[PDB]
């Protein structure tokens, strides 16, 4: 083994207790592990080995259902391959379950002992202790070896899970191409990355579909030898649980749908605003998102707000139930004339606990989780009797050749097709450009097949589509691609491909690996990296698509003019394109077109504590916890009571020799069950109100801060990882956290209802309880430190499955050209193998915690039990069966709670990822209390005096010392080069950032109002327009003030109306996402509405018309010129001439004003700036535009 596997010399014993997996955790308490720590898989679990087994099986059912003239039945197969395996596993299922009803016939016993308890006797205390001793192997078995147990059904999940893996990715590689048509990667992904998952969730669970009725039909059993009959009135209220908790499924799911509508609503909307926070923040339209957020998140959270509640009934059936069944049960037997008797409670409690969790849960999951199993096995049946490839398989010759791309009423894709090409030549194809005609490539290849027509080929294909792609691994190992590094054949052709020359610009060193998705090389150096593959590939038959001419270069020389036209017309090569100046030289050409081959012929024929702090006060005023304290406490209270006054009550019966006051007894006992489900429900909807309460906060709170935040964090946060935040931080914050909250406080008073229970019955055990308490805290920090780096382990190494996948699937024509089958395969099994050892060692690191975690709680069970009898002269009969019944039950919840800590504690971190941005900083108000007047822009005067400005705070200054007037209705262009130019002037003059030195307005200093105060009073044009998804009236009027004519005129001011008004909306017309519909000239046009209808005397317009039609780059003008007459107008040029009938010019390069003047005073001084500009245009155009300037100042 290259990373010995400590199964393999681990004693049988030791995998009982996971004794000996044990030095991993060694290295994990010092260090990070790393994925050399993880141990080799199990021999027999490798992705080739599951592969070749279940295959078999597979096909031995195909075989089945030919020969039955039946549909094959991959359940059925699977089956036939596991069960004689899988049965055995059964026994354990048998023995474990029959041992969880039989604890209670034992605690019977010992109970038994106390009725009759005498104090001169050894004998029934000699018989109790082996009853006791009988009851704590009875826990050895659930509490230690299941460990071991659940261990191999997981394994059984996973074996079967990667065995698929391999027989999918076998199936992918051996799929048509018309079954390609047929089918996308994203159902193969949904299909391997998630719907085979399912396989791990299934194998745990079913067993219990057959365990789960026998142990209840055991405990009725029980229940008749116990109670007689009355236990008939029990069962049927645990029986009704398993309908309505069924009904809940059915309505939550229903209100996740109902949800899931408005957070697409607002993470789509809140795409918009970190999309367009730059466009949004200079129209100051940071209020009409503001409105909308809220009101979405308003109607969204209503849903959810119900929906917890409606989920919190729920949880508080999983906690009262047995306090219901219980009641229903003794009452009954009561009244129908028994007495109560200790013996006879404690057995029928711990029975009713057993049969709870197996009826009330598990069998309820294990229908479900089948029922997503076998719909998921259907479809990956019916993948895998997808269509294959035909595996039938120095010249080739066509002739009469015919066939279609598919069988079809498409026209013939190839007619009157005959060549024939021997080795020293190249051949050639011509058709229409760009064509599919290409796909000839493809039935010389064998992915198409001919319909009639005779095909021969010998010797190997090498193939390149158009489309670049990268195997896994570095490039050299893409270029090797399974063959053997030839250093003298790769020198010679890297140097061939002129390679290595800009190899040490793109990997940056020759041994550098291929990063993520072949993310380090771009598309057209890697579309020669597939070319590269071709000549490396040395190959017989070479069938070259149509290159990417842009690679036209010397670089192309050396692998046309010289590789490809001299040394590979060695055997045979055919090039389809249109490069005529190469296939000029072409030994013969085949001319396509509609599906005619209409000639051929050569060429000339052409987490901290502040955390939670922060957390629960933004829920309700912190002395609501206080009053929450008293719910979570008390139904505590009266869920234990409840059962002690069961106790008590025997104890009574005990003194009579009469009858007991049924009608107090029973009267207060059916009290603390409406007392326990009571404060249950109230306690369950308490925690949910003040959590998602707090939800709402923390949302509100956070995206406040998005709003007010500065352009600058922008710059640096990536796009996603804000959007993250909103779509799925939050996202827990909602569906998750506060259910996963609260079953973890559910339980935690649970596990401390039984030991405050056992101390206060047996107060002597809290002193080993310490001990106890110690081991615990230290072995869940050893514990979790490992933990946690494991889980990270398997999520990342489980996304190269897929990614090879993804990738795999991309390149199957190169691939099975190259026949490349096992090296693929080699690959696939490689990652599957790697996410073997990670997911192997997740299953039994979780598990070495759960038995190293339950021998202690086994351990508590035991001391309980012997303590008792060693106190026998103090302890009430009634008062064992409580303590006992209680310790019984812990084996159960103890697992869950610790759990749901790590799952809680993890979670919490989407608390702190929103904290994070609850604090931001700020921009300055968008209100001041200084305020401009009404009549303040009626000026239109800006003042720059020592402009300094950086586009981040003590970056580059990108104005420097810029003092400047722009005057009342002047019209100035303002040019350089982009990043000294444009965006400094655009966020200085918008305070996207403060500028240093200052600013005025119309002789207000910028700095002295507020942000909206000024962004109110100027429109901006960016180059870039943004139309938000939502009326064209609100495109243009969120606040609803100016009426549709108007904003009709202004769609009459542009051409729009007469492309709008059509549409069924009119002014309301809901847009497409992102109005894509429009033309980006139209979307350029309506800003200018927004400006038309802002009617802002003062108006930047950025450079815009960069890339616009003339007439309607000029209809852009016209409108411009005309209504803005009076408006003071900033453009910035991406050409000039945008610009040549500006005023002035101020020159801003090297972010100093390098000229500020009239562009002809500029032109006629031949020195300026300007001019040497000027000329960059290299033509007499400079003329026209020198007149078009002389024109301004003819008066
Ligand atoms: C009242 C507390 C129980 C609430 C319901 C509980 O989650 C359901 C089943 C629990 C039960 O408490 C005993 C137990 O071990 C079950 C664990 C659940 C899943 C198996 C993996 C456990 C693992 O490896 O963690």
């Given at each position: 083994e290259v990373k010995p596997n400590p199964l393999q010399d681990a004693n049988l014993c030791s995998r009982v207790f996971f004794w000996w997996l044990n030095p991993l955790f060694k290295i994990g308490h010092k260090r990070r592990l790393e994925e050399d720590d993880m141990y080799s898989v199990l021999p027999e679990d490798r992705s080739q080995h599951l592969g070749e087994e279940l295959q078999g099986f597979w096909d031995k059912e195909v075989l089945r259902a030919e020969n039955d003239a039946q549909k094959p039945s991959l359940t059925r197969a699977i089956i036939k391959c596991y069960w004689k395996s899988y049965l055995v596993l059964g026994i354990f299922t048998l023995i474990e379950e029959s041992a969880k009803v039989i604890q209670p016939i034992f605690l019977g016993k010992i109970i038994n002992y106390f009725e009759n308890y005498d104090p001169m006797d050894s004998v029934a205390l000699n018989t109790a202790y082996a009853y006791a001793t009988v009851l704590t192997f009875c826990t050895l078995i659930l509490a230690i070896l299941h460990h071991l147990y659940f261990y191999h059904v997981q394994c059984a999940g996973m074996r079967l899970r990667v065995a698929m893996c391999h027989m999918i990715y076998r199936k992918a590689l051996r799929l048509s191409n018309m079954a390609m048509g047929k089918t996308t990667t994203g159902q193969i992904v949904n299909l391997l990355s998630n719907d085979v998952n399912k396989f791990d969730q299934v194998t745990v669970f079913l067993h219990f579909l057959w365990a789960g009725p026998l142990q209840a039909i055991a405990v009725t059993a029980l229940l008749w030898m116990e109670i007689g009959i009355s236990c008939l009135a029990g069962m049927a209220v645990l029986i009704i649980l398993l309908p309505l908790q069924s009904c809940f499924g059915k309505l939550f799911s229903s209100l996740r749908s109902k949800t899931a509508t408005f957070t697409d609503a607002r993470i789509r909307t809140m795409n918009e605003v970190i999309t367009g926070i730059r466009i949004i923040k200079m129209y100051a339209w940071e209020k009409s998102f503001s409105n909308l957020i809220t009101n979405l998140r308003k109607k969204e959270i209503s849903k959810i707000l119900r929906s917890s509640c409606l989920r919190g009934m729920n949880l508080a059936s999983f906690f009262s139930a047995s306090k219901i069944i219980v009641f229903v049960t003794f009452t009954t037997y009561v009244l129908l004339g028994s007495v109560i008797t200790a013996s006879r409670v404690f057995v029928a409690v711990t029975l009713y606990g057993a049969v709870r969790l197996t009826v009330t849960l598990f069998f309820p999951s294990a229908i479900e989780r089948v029922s997503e199993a076998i719909v998921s096995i259907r479809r990956i049946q019916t993948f895998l009797l997808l269509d294959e490839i035909s595996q039938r398989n120095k010249m080739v010759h066509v002739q009469d050749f015919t066939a279609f791309w598919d069988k079809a009423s498409e026209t013939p894709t190839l007619q009157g097709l005959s060549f024939t090409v021997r080795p020293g030549e190249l051949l050639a194809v011509v058709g229409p450009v760009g064509a599919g005609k290409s796909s000839l490539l493809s039935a010389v290849l064998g992915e198409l097949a001919p319909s009639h027509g005779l095909v021969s080929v010998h010797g190997r294909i090498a193939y390149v589509s158009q489309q670049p792609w990268v195997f896994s691994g570095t490039l050299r190992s893409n270029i090797l691609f399974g063959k053997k590094y030839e250093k003298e054949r790769y020198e010679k052709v890297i140097k061939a491909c002129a390679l290595k020359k800009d190899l040490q610009l793109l990997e940056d060193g020759d041994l550098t690996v291929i990063g993520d998705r072949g993310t380090t090389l771009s598309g057209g150096q890697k579309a020669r990296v597939n070319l590269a593959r071709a000549v490396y590939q040395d190959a017989d038959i070479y069938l070259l698509d149509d290159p990417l001419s842009a690679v036209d270069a010397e670089v192309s020389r050396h692998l046309f003019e010289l590789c490809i036209c001299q040394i590979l017309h060695e055997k045979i090569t055919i090039l389809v394109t249109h490069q005529l100046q190469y296939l000029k030289a072409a030994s013969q050409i085949l001319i396509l077109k509609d599906g005619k081959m209409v000639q051929k012929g050569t060429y000339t024929e052409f987490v901290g504590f502040q955390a939670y702090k922060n957390y629960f006060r933004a829920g309700a005023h912190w002395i609501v916890f206080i009053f929450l304290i008293l719910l979570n406490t008390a139904a505590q209270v009266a869920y234990v009571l409840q059962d002690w006054w069961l106790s008590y009550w025997a104890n009574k019966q005990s003194m009579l020799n009469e009858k007991l006051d049924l009608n107090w007894y029973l009267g207060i006992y059916s009290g603390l069950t409406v007392a326990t489900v009571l404060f249950g429900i109230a306690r369950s909807l308490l925690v949910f109100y003040v959590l998602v309460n707090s939800s709402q906060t923390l949302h509100n709170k956070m995206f406040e801060s998005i709003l007010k935040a500065p352009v600058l964090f922008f710059d640096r946060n990536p796009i996603g990882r804000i959007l993250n935040r909103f779509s799925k931080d939050i996202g827990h914050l909602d569906d998750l956290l506060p259910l996963t909250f609260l079953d973890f406080i559910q339980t935690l008073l649970q596990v401390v209802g039984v030991v405050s229970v056992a101390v206060a019955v047996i107060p002597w055990i809290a002193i080993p309880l310490v001990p106890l308490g110690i081991i615990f805290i230290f072995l869940r920090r050893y514990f979790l430190e490992?933990?946690?780096?494991?889980?990270?382990?398997?999520?990342?190494?489980?996304?190269?499955?897929?990614?090879?996948?993804?990738?795999?699937?991309?390149?199957?024509?190169?691939?099975?050209?190259?026949?490349?089958?096992?090296?693929?395969?080699?690959?696939?099994?490689?990652?599957?193998?790697?996410?073997?050892?990670?997911?192997?060692?997740?299953?039994?690191?979780?598990?070495?915690?759960?038995?190293?975690?339950?021998?202690?709680?086994?351990?508590?069970?035991?001391?309980?039990?012997?303590?008792?009898?060693?106190?026998?002269?103090?302890?009430?009969?009634?008062?064992?069966?409580?303590?006992?019944?209680?310790?019984?039950?812990?084996?159960?919840?103890?697992?869950?709670?610790?759990?749901?800590?790590?799952?809680?504690?993890?979670?919490?971190?989407?608390?702190?990822?929103?904290?994070?941005?609850?604090?931001?900083?700020?921009?300055?108000?968008?209100?001041?209390?200084?305020?401009?007047?009404?009549?303040?822009?009626?000026?239109?005067?800006?003042?720059?005096?020592?402009?300094?400005?950086?586009?981040?705070?003590?970056?580059?200054?990108?104005?420097?010392?810029?003092?400047?007037?722009?005057?009342?209705?002047?019209?100035?262009?303002?040019?350089?080069?982009?990043?000294?130019?444009?965006?400094?002037?655009?966020?200085?003059?918008?305070?996207?950032?403060?500028?240093?030195?200052?600013?005025?307005?119309?002789?207000?200093?910028?700095?002295?109002?507020?942000?909206?105060?000024?962004?109110?009073?100027?429109?901006?044009?960016?180059?870039?327009?943004?139309?938000?998804?939502?009326?064209?009236?609100?495109?243009?009027?969120?606040?609803?003030?100016?009426?549709?004519?108007?904003?009709?005129?202004?769609?009459?001011?542009?051409?729009?109306?007469?492309?709008?008004?059509?549409?069924?909306?009119?002014?309301?017309?809901?847009?497409?996402?992102?109005?894509?519909?429009?033309?980006?000239?139209?979307?350029?046009?309506?800003?200018?509405?927004?400006?038309?209808?802002?009617?802002?005397?003062?108006?930047?317009?950025?450079?815009?018309?960069?890339?616009?039609?003339?007439?309607?780059?000029?209809?852009?003008?016209?409108?411009?010129?005309?209504?803005?007459?009076?408006?003071?107008?900033?453009?910035?040029?991406?050409?000039?001439?945008?610009?040549?009938?500006?005023?002035?010019?101020?020159?801003?390069?090297?972010?100093?004003?390098?000229?500020?003047?009239?562009?002809?005073?500029?032109?006629?001084?031949?020195?300026?700036?300007?001019?040497?500009?000027?000329?960059?245009?290299?033509?007499?155009?400079?003329?026209?535009?020198?007149?078009?300037?002389?024109?301004?100042?003819?008066?």
């Open positions: 490992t933990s946690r780096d494991v889980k990270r382990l398997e999520s990342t190494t489980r996304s190269p499955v897929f990614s090879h996948l993804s990738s795999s699937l991309q390149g199957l024509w190169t691939i099975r050209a190259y026949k490349a089958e096992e090296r693929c395969q080699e690959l696939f099994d490689a990652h599957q193998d790697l996410h073997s050892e990670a997911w192997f060692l997740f299953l039994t690191t979780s598990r070495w915690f759960a038995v190293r975690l339950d021998a202690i709680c086994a351990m508590f069970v035991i001391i309980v039990a012997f303590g008792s009898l060693i106190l026998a002269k103090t302890l009430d009969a009634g008062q064992v069966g409580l303590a006992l019944s209680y310790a019984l039950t812990l084996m159960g919840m103890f697992q869950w709670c610790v759990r749901q800590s790590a799952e809680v504690e993890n979670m919490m971190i989407s608390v702190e990822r929103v904290i994070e941005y609850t604090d931001l900083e700020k921009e300055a108000p968008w209100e001041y209390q200084k305020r401009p007047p009404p009549a303040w822009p009626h000026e239109g005067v800006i003042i720059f005096d020592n402009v300094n400005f950086m586009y981040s705070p003590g970056g580059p200054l990108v104005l420097k010392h810029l003092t400047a007037l722009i005057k009342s209705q002047e019209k100035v262009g303002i040019v350089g080069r982009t990043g000294a130019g444009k965006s400094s002037l655009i966020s200085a003059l918008f305070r996207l950032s403060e500028p240093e030195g200052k600013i005025w307005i119309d002789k207000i200093l910028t700095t002295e109002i507020g942000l909206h105060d000024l962004r109110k009073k100027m429109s901006i044009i960016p180059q870039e327009p943004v139309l938000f998804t939502g009326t064209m009236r609100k495109n243009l009027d969120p606040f609803n003030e100016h009426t549709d004519e108007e904003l009709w005129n202004a769609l009459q001011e542009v051409q729009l109306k007469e492309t709008i008004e059509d549409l069924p909306g009119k002014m309301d017309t809901e847009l497409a996402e992102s109005g894509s519909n429009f033309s980006v000239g139209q979307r350029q046009l309506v800003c200018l509405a927004r400006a038309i209808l802002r009617k802002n005397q003062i108006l930047i317009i950025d450079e815009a018309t960069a890339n616009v039609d003339p007439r309607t780059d000029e209809l852009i003008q016209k409108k411009i010129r005309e209504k803005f007459a009076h408006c003071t107008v900033l453009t910035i040029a991406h050409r000039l001439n945008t610009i040549i009938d500006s005023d002035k010019i101020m020159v801003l390069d090297s972010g100093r004003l390098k000229e500020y003047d009239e562009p002809y005073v500029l032109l006629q001084n031949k020195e300026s700036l300007f001019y040497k500009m000027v000329q960059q245009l290299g033509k007499a155009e400079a003329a026209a535009l020198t007149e078009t300037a002389k024109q301004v100042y003819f008066k």
